[PDB]
């Protein structure tokens, strides 16, 4: 069983909630060593990706 492919959130924006949550996901069983390093590694790559924001105000076609 696996959740369908729903596009919404993205790998970025580190937060407390997202920490404990994402942590358990990668935990699988109950590995503190993995969930630890992984959690940190994820946060790092998270900040890296996602560039700055812009305006973007198109207007063409129907």
């Amino acid at each position: 069983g696996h959740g369908t492919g729903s596009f919404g959130d993205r790998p970025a924006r580190p937060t407390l909630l997202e920490q404990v949550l994402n942590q358990k996901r990668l935990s699988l069983l109950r590995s503190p060593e993995v969930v630890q390093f992984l959690q940190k590694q994820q946060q790092l790559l998270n900040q890296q990706v996602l560039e700055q924001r812009q305006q973007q105000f198109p207007g063409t076609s129907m």
Binding site: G8, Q52, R53
Partner: protein
């Protein structure tokens, strides 16, 4: 609340801390207490109550890009 223990990095560098491991298992079970999927969505995909983006936070250079 007395005594003079060592540092965390030190006690850890020499060997894993019982509190660290135990703690991890503590919270892990806390959430596991209920549905992991149902909650996973209710959390990671929270509906976000009346926050209006932290009262119009309007981020800029708080944390997104910098260097390397």
């Amino acid at each position: 609340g007395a005594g003079e223990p060592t540092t965390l990095l030190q006690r850890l560098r020499g060997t894993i801390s019982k509190a660290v491991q135990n703690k991890v298992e503590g919270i892990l079970q806390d959430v596991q207490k209920f549905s992991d999927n149902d909650k996973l969505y209710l959390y990671l995909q929270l509906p976000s109550g009346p926050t209006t983006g932290d009262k119009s936070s309007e981020p800029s250079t708080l944390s997104n890009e910098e260097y390397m």
